[model samples]
Every structure is written in C-alpha cells, then in structure tokens.
Target: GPMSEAADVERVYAAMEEAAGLLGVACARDKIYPLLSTFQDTLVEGGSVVWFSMASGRHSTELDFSISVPTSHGDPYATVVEKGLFPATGHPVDDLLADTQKHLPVSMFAIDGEVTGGFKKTYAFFPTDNMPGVAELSAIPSMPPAVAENAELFARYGLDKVQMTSMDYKKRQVNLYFSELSAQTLEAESVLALVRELGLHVPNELGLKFCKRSFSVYPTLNWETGKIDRLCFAVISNDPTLVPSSDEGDIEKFHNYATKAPYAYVGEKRTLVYGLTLSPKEEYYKLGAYYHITDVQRGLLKAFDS
Candidate 1:
C-alpha cells in the first residue's frame, strides 16, 4: 500500500503521465487514464495497487504499467479482459491466467507497451510459494524450456531462491527474478563468464561493464518453441562496490554522471533509484529504475536538499 487518499492515487498517475511524457511516449494521458479509473474505483489506493515504469531501449522509450489488485478486490482477470486492458488477439492471456492461477496465485497483471499502443505485450507475476528453483514451474508443461534451463542453472550456482517468476504472453517468455539477496556472491565478471560459457557471447561494452555484482539475469524465451531470446544482467547501482557509497549524496553523484547518458532521463526524480541492465545484443537496455513518488519517499526526499 503506497497511497491512502484519493488525491494520492491521482498523484501517482500524474507521475506516470509526467514520466511517460519525458520518455517520449505519445498518448500517455489518454491510455493511462483508463487504467487509472479502473483500479481507482475498485481497489483501495492505500495498498500497493499500481506501479509505473519507463524503459529506454536502443530504438525507443517504452512504458510499463502494472496493477496488483489487493486480496480485497478479488480476482481482476475478468475485469481486465472485459475491459480489453490487455491484447487478446493471438495471445492466450486469459488461459495463461487460468492455468497459472490453478497452482500459484497470480499477483499482478503488467503490460509492456508504448503509451499510444495499449498492451502490445502482457505479463503475469507468480510467486513461487517460498520454494526455491524452477521445479514448481517445470510442473507446468507450458513453462518455456529456456526458463527452466536458466532457473536450474542459476539454482545450481546457489541462486535458487526465486523472488518472483513472470510470464510474458506475447513473447511466450519467462523472466526469473533472483533478487539481490539471492545473488550475494555473484559478481559481474562471473556473470559474463556464465553467459559466455553458455554461448550467450555477451558483449563486454554494455552496462554490465560497470557492474561489480550481477543481481538479476532476466531471460526471454519462446513458450511453445522453447528458444532463448536474450539474457540480461542487472546490478544494484547503489551497492557500495559500484558507487563510492550508498549514501544519498554519493547516489546523487552517480546519478548526475548517468544523467549525462544520451538516451532517456537517467536521474529524473520520478524514477531516481536505478540499476543498469546489460544484454547480449540490444544496443540500449533499461536501467533498473524505481518509481519513488507515492510512498514514504515524499518525506524522504523532503529531508534531502534537492
């Protein structure tokens, strides 16, 4: 729960519109408002209902919108589908919801798309019930091979404990998250070696070049085909090894340097705290950025002199 008041909900959307605008996503206000009204009316704003994210890829800037309907609001599948929130053509988003829901609770519905084009891709987040590894996911025949393979690989290397496993309907992809704590012993060089050993042949010049510890190894896969699309490595930018320190001042300094980056507003306040994403091929990948406008950060920022 990040917001309680109705105005706080609006503020969060306003931040979304603002960030989308800066990222060059057209029709943000129009497309985002529907999502705004849907969740605002049913779910309590006090809970963690919605999230806004921006990604700056090599070719374009994209926006990510996610909503986690609180338990009180019940299952959002029907509402989302009925309202056409996600693209259903050629994608079995509803069936994806039903099958995954049978085993694990569907925590959230997220869409990766441009502001003008709603739901170009759809994602579902499922918690692994505190279990480690991909055994649970493997039970689902629909699970992509690359996903299970990568999960097993990471688990064999002691990164077994998955925080969340996300399924992308459009790409037939599975993204496994091993959170920061799970990869405490992981380093950037080790990750590069792992990918290279696996034949990913990740270019050394991307964002991973600067990372000291590699945290999340996000991979994309084709569900039916079981083909590996790409692998991305991310590092906690605030880690002491990466920056001089994680203190606000040092973090600000690092952001100031990243602000000089060519694409996207790296250090914008709306998405301040960020990590870097390195891929095998994509020219520009996303920085792991967090939207910090709605929660206690408001006061946290107040304490820090801008």
Candidate 2:
C-alpha cells in the first residue's frame, strides 16, 4: 500500500498485529494511535525517521515510539517541550539532559506509553563512547552501578566495553548497553550464562531463540546493603535474513536465525527482531522485534510539511 499519515499508522498497526500473532500479546492501539500521530506531526522533521518497537514478554507487550532530531532543529529537548509533547518542568528530564549531554551528544528520544502509568515516561539516548566526535575519555561522565563492577562478565563474552547508555525519565533509571566489538558468536546460551552469573532469574518459558544477541542492563543500588542491585537483563537480536530475499545469498553467512519471524509483516523492511528485556519479577524477559519503517516515516514527514 502507498504511504500517508493514515497509511503509516495502518502499517504500524499491521506490524503490531503480526507481533500479536507471533508473541501472543496485544497493543492498546486506540489509545496509542493518537500519541503516535502527535509525534509524527509535532516532532518529526524533514529526512527524519520514527521508530516503532514492540516489546513482548510472557506477562506483557509494549509499544514505544522514537524519533531522531537533527542539529538543524536546534535543541532537541526544547523541541519536545515546545511542541507540547513533554513538560519542561516538574520532571527530572532536565537533570538527565544536563548530566549526560554535558559529556556526550544525544542520539534520539523515545516514549514508552503502553503500560500502566507509563505514558509520561521519556527516554534520552546518547551515542556510544567509541563513536566518532564524542568527547574525549578524560571528559566523559560516569554514573552509579558502573560497568566496572562486572568486568569479569563483560570479559567472558569479550564485550568488555560498554556501547552506550539511556535514561528513563519517570523511573529515573540508566540503561547500559554492551556488545562484542570484533566478530564473535553470541547465542542465547551466552545470555543465560550472564544471567546466572548475576544471580538473576532467567525467562525460560519464553523459549527465546534468535540468531545473534547483545546486552542491555539496568542496575541500581541497594540502599540498606550498599551493593549494586541489577534489575533487568536484556538480550538484543537483529538479523535481516529473517525476511525472504533472493539476494541474501551473499550475506547469508552472517545472518542470525529467528524461528518465529512473521515474514508478512517483516517484508523487505530492515528488521530488528527479538530485543529481549529480562527482569527478575517475571518468568519471561520482554522479547521485542522492530521494523525500521523509515519510508513510511518519511511519508508522514512530507505530508506534515505540506
């Protein structure tokens, strides 16, 4: 189908339907569609992209929206507030921006709005430390529950370095990212091994199987014990080979497997499947699959400009 504002939303809904079928969880489309439309209208600029991510666990499935802001737009945080998407006051986001941006540049902003009392939460992501143009190592800022404590864990998989980190405004939490810099085999078992090492529960019921994986962790401090208390462990997967393609023969050797992928929804779109979020409370880690629908997003942006 052709792309339009309505068409883009429909395409997202169609992807959600595919996810619901694959993961057995539903999205609150009625409530979220308006929120999606607003971001598409007020925030998206020319040549920008809006991301739709569906996170499915045994207990829940969530839909999140993300948009990138070019420097051409001036201050990205101010744009969100001025556009009336988020408040400038009565939130810790300012502190977050002040704290992180002082060290590195922001990459994008996201909203996780599908859960109970979750609509107001905002996310700010900064580029990885190794990325070009980032501040020198001497100037980079550090936060609590630092990755240094788990040097052994990182060393185990050769992901001894951090990729980047993100902040959640409502919960006021920092999410850390890690990956193997050089080409190495990362499987589900490797992730489970990391979970066992951390003494956190694993989501065995989800029976997650994917091609390759990366790591995301949320760590906090135990006030009474003065020890680092890690909350969530996520295993991320992205293998475009899940989509049917005749030309994949050249890249087939590098593809990871996704046994549950819905080819109909994934069609030709750059696919990011199985972004797994494993928490201690539930027996399931949130399994997520995302499609980079930039063309549809570009269409939305074009209509808004006209």
Candidate 3:
C-alpha cells in the first residue's frame, strides 16, 4: 500500500518535470511532486497526448510527433495545424474532426492525466488498426486552390472562417466526415440490385444522426439524372451549430442557406472547387466506396456532356 502511494508521488515529480520541460514551461524547479500536481495541463500542437516509438519494419526506426512544444500556444486544434499533423487535408480543421480517423495512443501511464487526458480515450467508430494514443486521417484528399488558400489564410489569422472576394463562395463553417471502410462482409449480391436499391431508395433507405439539430447525409449521387460522379452520395447537414460561429457574418450567411434550402449539400465541395457566390462553402466528408458503382462511366462521370 505504502509502495503504491510512494511510487505515485515519485511519479508525479518526474512526470511534471518532463511535461514542463517538453512544453518548455519553466515551472519553479522543486523536488516536490505535489507541487507539480497543482499545475494545469496543455495540449501538444492540437493533441493533448504524446506519440512515439511507432517505428515499423526491419532494422530501422522512425517516429512522429505532430505537436510542437515551441509553436504551440496550447490550443489542441491549433497545435495540430502548426505541426501539420496527420489527416491534414489542408481543409478547414473544423471539418476534419468528424471523420472516422485512426489513433495511435499511449498505453503506458507515462503520459496520463486530466491535463493530457491520458491519450487514446477509446475506440471510436473510426477504422485504424494501430493501438491507442496514435491517430491518422485516412485517405485525406487534395483541396481546391482557393479552399486551400483560405485555410492557409485562416491559419495565418488564427481564425476559422473567412470572407473572401477571389473566392466566390465561403463556408462559415464546415461539418463533414469521410471514411474508407472495409467492404461489406455481408452478402452484397454483387451489384445490379444493390446499385438500384441505393440509387432509387437513398433518402428512404438509410437514416442519419446528430447533437444540435436535424441531421442528414447526402449521397454524392444524381437522383433522377444519369449523372454519376465520385462526388455523389456524400452527405451534409444544416446544423450551423455543429460549426460554431466566431462572427456575425457567419450567422447571416447561414440564414441565407437554411432559409433557401436548409438540408441540401449546398454545393459545399462544388463551391470549393469552382467558386460560385450562390454556393455554400462548407467542407464535406467523402467515403472510399465511391470508387466502384458498376463501372466508372456509370458511376464516376464528371459532367452533363459526358
């Protein structure tokens, strides 16, 4: 019994100093473990945890630390960007958190606490094979130049949403996720039937979820037209609450969209790719399955002429 408490005391003394040193916080040097306990915690880059020893393969070793002690000002999300952490789609960070991501976490008690949140909270619906305390953004994609540019500008200004002139549309906030899941193990029936079912009964078939308001996931698909693009069958939501606003213009822009066609995808991706003032600039999450829809011509065509 005494050994455990004794060890814990010794533990805190060491942990605090290391954390302090890593964060470069020159907390008054003292031999007291209890004193370190009084200090609050800080996130690494945007991450609260530390990831290391992820060396893979034979006769070689490499590691990743996405968070930066120097560049970090302690915002978990901010630090993530400063370090250009994984799943860095160059998309708005607000949009990336929702996707099913992989995490490599700390299993050892070495980095654990309310301050650091003890890496790897739990196994979320996300699909990453690695252990806890580690994370990854699966198959993140390139962005439209303007969208990428906007993200950079936002990073520069320490802001999320921006009002841009060169960009025709601007998303005040984007809340979307994408995942590359293992294909269904169930009897997929190959195609024809499955395609028809999804094609015709999309809205009627699968339901959606939420926390702030009505939730919907739009498939990046053409409902009536023969138009099938990789962008089809993706989803979007009308919940601006999911993406909180830091400015009044955000709310105003939201009103314009909601009142006009609240639940639609509003060309979030479209606006990003080809800026049109009328389009909603919100970011979206896409899935890996859009790869096959009974052949590319029928599934991944780009335009009307095609």
Candidate 4:
C-alpha cells in the first residue's frame, strides 16, 4: 500500500519524539538546567515536553514547556490529548504545532471514539497532593464514586486506569469509556471485554453510559527505559470484531483504524506506531501532573542526548 497523509503525520511525529526523548535525558542528567541544548535554539518555537522515570510502580514524571515561557495555562495538566501536529521536515516548528492542534483525529472505520465536550479544564479529579489515587499522603479523600467503583473491575482485567472523558463527538449523548489507559499490558482483548462490560452494564451501575468503542490511552514502554518512548497516549483503534485485535503494537494499530472495526485491523504494516502528544481544548494542563511544573527554577543545565 502506498503511504498516506497519515503516513507523513507519523514520520514527522517521529522526529519530534526523538527530540522529546533526547530532551528527557538532558533533564535527568543535567542537575542544573531543565533540558539539553540540541535544538531548542534552532528547531522549536515554544513548547517541548520530556518524560523521565519516576518513583512509582506505575507512573513517570514529564516536563513540558520550552526553556522559557512555561505554561501558567493548562496544556501541562491536560489529561486528554486534543490535537496532534506534524510538519514537513525543516518546516516551522510553531506552524507544525498549530496545524496539529487544528484536527481532533477521526477514525474512518474503527470505533467511533470521538470525545464530545473535548478536554475539561474545570475537571477536578486529582488529589490535593500530587498522586494517582487514594493514599495516606493524599489530601483528597478518593476518586469519584463512578470511577472508584470500577477501579477494581478494570484492575482485575489488567488495566491501570479507566477514564470517561466529559463528552465526545457524534451524538455526544454521554458515551461510555470515553477514554481509558491500560496499566502494564497492551492486550486489546482484555480491554475489549472490560469495555463490553462497561457498555453492557457498568455505566448503569455508575449512573453513566457504557463505553462504546471510544478513544483511549496507554503507556507502552516501562518508565525506567529512558527517553524516546514515543507517547504514553494514543487513541485506541477499537476493532470490536473478535476475529483479530489485541496487541496491534501501538501506532500501527491505531492508524487507519477505520479499516478494521467489528471486523479486521486497519492501515498498512507497522512503520512507526505512535503519533503527536496533544492537549484537549478543554482539559486543564496541570503545572506538575507528573514531572514537576516546579514552583521554582534552577541555574545550571545539560543534555545527556548530547
């Protein structure tokens, strides 16, 4: 099959991802400056995010922003990615980011997983203290009843997190499983079963709608693996057809998902399996969702990727 526009999107994203990975190493190694000095001086315009390993069984720290002009806005704490941009090689970095922000990504055939209201900026679902869920140190009490109730169900099925983005595209009648993030594995079959159950009954259990093949996210590589792990987020190519789904292998599984829904997989064989990391228009971009959007700044800086 010939490469499509989506093909170009993946390739351009590749270069950005490599840059992001290199940036991550700089943050960890350089004890003084936040990231390395490979391209920010010449490549990008404003925002760049780097991710590094964290002290947790299931989380990692991410640093988002350019060397200067960090977001006092919500692009950092954003839970759902709204736009994914890719520019022609050597194109203007800001232009690429803007173009990526324009589209919300659609499935020509796979699950109709378009988010409705988009990312919710006012959504307050985190602990007062920085943490994933309920713990002794957590200032908040616990997750909302709806999510809290299904935590065990999702966990039992090998999932790390099961989320319901506020509203999505199509009818936007309040769909189920608007988004979900898997824990340690990428077994689509297992996730499918859980989604089926949610669509069939869990929403009624939580006074919400059951998931119906909506978009979702999952972390692919282990955090300790160092920089350049693509993205921890990707809209799921939910091919409801039990014939053959599961383990589609990241980006390859998602691209052209419209080809295989309730039937077969979509797109061509794997080239690159991840795309751009975006910010949902409505979600709050936290200052320190994982890697601290720290309260202060440092003096020295370095880059391990150098």
Candidate number achieving the greatest lDDT relative to the actual structure: 1
Residue-by-residue lDDT tens digits, candidate 4, 1-306: 234543432332343333334323122232212112222221133232221111111111232222222222322212113222111223122122222123212111011110111111111122123223312111212212333444465457544432322211122111122123333233445434543554321122211111122134422111122211221222222221111112343223222222221110123221111112212111111111111112111110111001
Clashing pairs in 1: 1-47, 1-48
lDDT of 1 by residue, 1-306 (tens): 444556655765665566566555655566766665676743344335344444443433565655555434544545556788865545443455455556665655444444565554444555435433567755565556555666656665555555555556555556666543343335556666656655564655434544434445555566565445656555433222343233464455345433422222235433333334434554233432344323333443343213
Per residue, candidate 2 scores C-alpha lDDT tens digits across 1-306 of 224666755665565455454434466665556555655542323444444444323343444544444443344445455666555655444455445556656665555454222244444454444432112311434433344444444566555444445555545455545433333424566656756666665645233332242333443422123233454444433343432123343124124224443333344433343343444443333333444444433342243222
CA lDDT of each prediction against the hidden true structure: 0.50, 0.44, 0.23, 0.24
Q: What is the clash count of model 2?
A: 1
Ten-residue region with minimum lDDT total, candidate 4: 297-306
Query: Whole-model lDDT for model 4 versus the true structure?
Result: 0.24
Best by TM-score: 1
lDDT of 3 by residue, 116-222 (tens): 21111111222123321111222323112233423432233222221110100112222212222112311133222323433432211111111111111111211
Question: Model 4: runs farther than 4 Å from truth?
Answer: 1-45, 48-143, 161-185, 200-306
C-alpha lDDT of candidate 3 relative to the true structure: 0.23
lDDT minimum window of 10 residues, candidate 1? 257-266
Model 1: how far residue 8 lies from native, Å:
4.9
Instruction: RMSD for all candidates, in order, please.
Output: 7.1, 9.5, 22.5, 19.1
**Superposed model 2: Cα runs more than 4 Å off:** 1-38, 41-51, 54-58, 71-94, 115-129, 132-160, 181-197, 202-270, 281-283, 293-306
| Pairs that clash in candidate 2 | 211-257
Better TM-score candidate (2, 4): 2
Q: Mark the regions of model 1 whose C-alpha exceeds 4 Å error after superposition.
A: 1-9, 41-44, 49-51, 57-59, 71-77, 89-94, 105-113, 120-132, 149-152, 180-185, 201-211, 236-280, 292-306
